[PDB]
């Protein structure tokens, strides 16, 4: 770009004109090209700061998802994250999140606690689920019904404060033996 000068070529203006005015055109080229270069450097600074933010994000992603299991949902890809594998890419990295995603589900029934004898039973870990006729205990993210037992549940309550409680019998492996 001429930037308002006679010509845009330094070896042209120098070899065609004599300093007096000339310098003027060379100073015009200076104040054009230096400002253009400053624009370039400022844009590069912006872009490099953004890339630095993205790189810190990538480094934290590596340190969490790859070097361990990350409990933060949706951080290491969609779903319950399991592990990740890094891969090198030009000027960047590519992650392969391996995530556990649930599948076919069914309405069953559920109750917050089961009252056997004046006492409310709550699941140690999992969900109180009912086929529809026989109450069961299971996991949270996978259906695995198990017979209700005094080890699968912990008891604390009076069968009169918990709303939604249901009547059922819990078994103990101790009375039999």
């Amino acid at each position: 770009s001429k930037f308002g000068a006679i010509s845009s070529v330094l070896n042209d203006i120098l070899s065609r004109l004599d300093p007096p005015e000339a310098e003027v055109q060379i100073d015009r080229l200076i104040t054009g090209r230096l400002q253009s270069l400053q624009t370039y450097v400022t844009q590069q600074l912006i872009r490099a700061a953004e890339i630095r933010a993205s790189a810190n994000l990538a480094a934290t992603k590596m340190s969490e998802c790859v070097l361990g299991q990350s409990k933060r949902v949706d951080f290491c890809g969609k779903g319950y994250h399991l592990m990740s594998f890094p891969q090198s890419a030009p000027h960047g990295v590519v992650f392969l999140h391996v995530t556990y995603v649930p599948a076919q589900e069914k309405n069953f029934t559920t109750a917050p606690a089961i009252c056997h004898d004046g006492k409310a039973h709550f699941p140690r870990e999992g969900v109180f689920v009912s086929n529809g006729t026989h109450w069961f205990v299971t996991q949270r993210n996978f259906y695995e019904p198990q017979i209700i037992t005094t080890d699968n549940t912990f008891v604390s309550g009076n069968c009169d404060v918990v709303i939604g409680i249901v009547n059922n019998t819990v078994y103990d492996p101790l009375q039999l033996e």
Partner: protein, 621 residues
């Protein structure tokens, strides 16, 4: 490479006037001419250029023959049929290879298509030619590059254009170039394979902004659209009084510099042709204003300080100057915005036996601050004497501009009058002679209200202009309302339909159809503007009635609104996305479908637990 250039070109799908030959009209020449002709062997010899085509203005002749050309710049008289009868001031002849190539494959099937383009930028006449063995179509359509042949420095005012014929016992195709922006696709060999005009269609114009020949799917901000004022109203003072400039110049006793007679020019119309008339001009150095365009300005107050002074002091008078006169007699303000005028007057300030009437000061206790008169008779002190008188060490302040009809150039009685203007925001009383047109409201129109040039839509207002109020503004300091000088009413000022054009298109590898957006403007205004042909964009996208959709993000033209909901393909804005969907294919606009409408079965005691699971491997980059 896809180099883009801005040069005089024949617009794509422009109009070439097709003629016949069985008398030879003169065609106007302006910004170059494209020429093409299909002839069996030869029926056209050359072309002649120039102005008035007579023996008063230099002309041109580009006649050819079997073996060479006859380029010459001459002042031929006429032929009315040996093609000229005058060679008086006719030099700069030129002879080189002929311009016409004709080849046949043992058959006259070739009409030898001859494409020519001429132009006269800064003289340096340029001729470009390219002969394509004629195909079935006379002026067909396939691309054909045009190569230069000669370029030699003509340097004459080419305005008219004519052609020459042959003898014997459907051609002549002529077009005109205007300045446009072109994008050209350069072949690997360096030739030109495809070119696209950036003023033809939305896809072409975008193509000329994403600098490529493939516009991929998406929406691209390209340019802006602006309505063009159909009219141009100027409103100037109700009076048409000629200024007393004549009396300022027809004076006989222009006061000397030490007492600069300052006149006042107000409530009048300044026509400076009378200034030119009473002026054998020698020095018309205007500083704040170009002297040529002095009749198109409105000034608040005009000052005419007149004084007769020597020759070199004419060069002395200028802002930021110095000298015995410029420092103690008449200092112009540095920020002077006006004109000074000097014309020789040896007939009124001279006589036999001498004339010592005029005066000037070389002795002042200090400098004269700009625009100040120091008429006073006080003897300058030297040393420390309170002396009051003339002689040595006691100098009389002002000396004499003695004038007799015999000096040299620098010492004759030059007559000097300076014009000082006040070109600021104020109700002007002095303007140039112009015809106050009528007033048109609710229409984009260039306005020149009392010298305030601009463009926009005017209308009535319910403002409360105080009697002295003249202008309007906002916290941004831009002229908003201007009181009518000849009706004393308040008129607002608006932008002339400013917006921004974005073109929605799918990939050109898929289709060529496009959808145009005019940003943040109701289509009712662009519809009437398009129907009035006052829109800045030249590409006129089709409007079938079904292709108009006032969005919240502007208004859409070229796409039909479909009430269905789909995933966004091309975001337009305000929840509206357009996509290329089958009917058999077209461009439609629709509202966002944020996702599949789903309802959960939440209940007091109903739970969903998966009986199975899947392992999914996504990617993140």
């Amino acid at each position: 490479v896809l180099h883009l250039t801005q040069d005089l070109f024949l617009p794509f799908f422009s109009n070439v006037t097709w003629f016949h030959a069985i008398d030879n009209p003169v065609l106007p020449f302006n910004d170059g001419v494209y020429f093409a002709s299909t002839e069996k062997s030869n029926i056209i010899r050359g072309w002649i250029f120039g102005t008035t085509l007579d023996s008063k203005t230099q002309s041109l002749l580009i006649v050819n023959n079997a073996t060479n050309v006859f380029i010459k710049v001459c002042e031929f008289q006429f032929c009315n049929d040996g093609v000229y009868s005058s060679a008086n001031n006719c030099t700069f002849e030129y002879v080189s290879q002929p311009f016409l190539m004709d080849l046949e494959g043992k058959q006259g099937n070739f009409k030898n298509l001859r494409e020519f383009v001429f132009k006269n930028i800064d003289g340096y006449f340029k001729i470009y030619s390219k002969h394509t063995p004629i195909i079935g179509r006379d002026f067909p359509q396939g691309f054909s590059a045009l190569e230069p042949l000669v370029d030699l420095p003509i340097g004459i005012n080419i305005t008219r254009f004519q052609t020459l014929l042959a003898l014997n016992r459907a051609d002549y195709y002529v077009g005109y170039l205007q300045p446009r922006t072109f994008l050209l696709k350069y072949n690997e060999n360096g030739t030109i394979t495809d070119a696209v005009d950036c003023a033809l269609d939305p896809l072409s114009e975008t193509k000329c902004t994403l600098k490529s020949f493939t516009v991929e799917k998406g929406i691209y901000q390209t340019s802006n659209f602006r309505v063009q004022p159909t009219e141009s109203i100027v409103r100037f003072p109700n009076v048409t009084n000629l200024c007393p400039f004549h009396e300022v110049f027809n004076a006989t006793r222009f006061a000397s510099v030490y007492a600069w007679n300052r006149t006042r020019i107000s409530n009048c119309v300044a026509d400076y042709s009378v200034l030119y008339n009473f002026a054998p001009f020698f020095a018309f150095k205007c500083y704040g204003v170009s002297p040529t365009k002095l009749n198109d300005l409105c000034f608040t107050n005009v000052y005419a300080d007149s004084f007769v002074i020597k020759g070199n002091e004419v060069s002395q008078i200028a802002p930021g100057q110095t000298g015995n006169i410029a420092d103690y007699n008449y200092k112009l303000p540095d920020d002077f915005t006006g004109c000074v005028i000097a014309w020789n007057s040896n007939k009124l300030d001279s006589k036999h036996s001498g004339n010592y009437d005029y005066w000037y000061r070389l002795f002042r206790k200090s400098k004269l601050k700009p625009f100040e008169r120091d008429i006073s008779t006080e003897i300058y002190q030297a040393g420390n004497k309170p002396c009051k008188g003339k002689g040595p060490n006691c100098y009389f302040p002002l000396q004499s501009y003695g004038f007799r009809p015999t000096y040299g150039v620098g010492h004759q009685p030059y007559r000097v009058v300076v014009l000082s203007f006040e070109l600021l925001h104020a109700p002007a009383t002095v303007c140039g002679p112009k015809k106050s047109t009528n007033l048109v409201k609710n229409k984009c129109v260039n306005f020149n209200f009392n010298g305030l040039t601009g463009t926009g839509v005017l209308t009535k207002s319910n403002k409360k202009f105080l009697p002295f109020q003249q202008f309007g503004r906002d916290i941004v300091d831009t002229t908003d309302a201007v009181r009518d000088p000849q009706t004393l009413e308040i008129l607002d000022i608006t932008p002339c339909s400013f917006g921004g054009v974005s073109v929605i298109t799918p990939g050109t590898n898929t289709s060529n159809q496009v959808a145009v957006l005019y940003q943040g403007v109701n289509c009712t205004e662009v519809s009437v503007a398009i129907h009035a042909d006052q829109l800045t964009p030249t590409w006129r996208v089709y409007s079938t009635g079904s292709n108009v959709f006032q969005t919240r993000a502007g208004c859409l033209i070229g796409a039909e609104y479909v009430n269905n909901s789909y995933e966004c393909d091309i975001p337009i804005g305000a929840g509206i996305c357009a996509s290329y969907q089958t009917q058999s294919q077209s461009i439609i606009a629709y509202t966002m479908s944020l996702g599949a409408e789903n309802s959960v079965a939440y209940s007091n005691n109903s739970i969903a637990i998966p009986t199975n699971f899947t392992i999914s491997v996504t990617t993140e980059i």
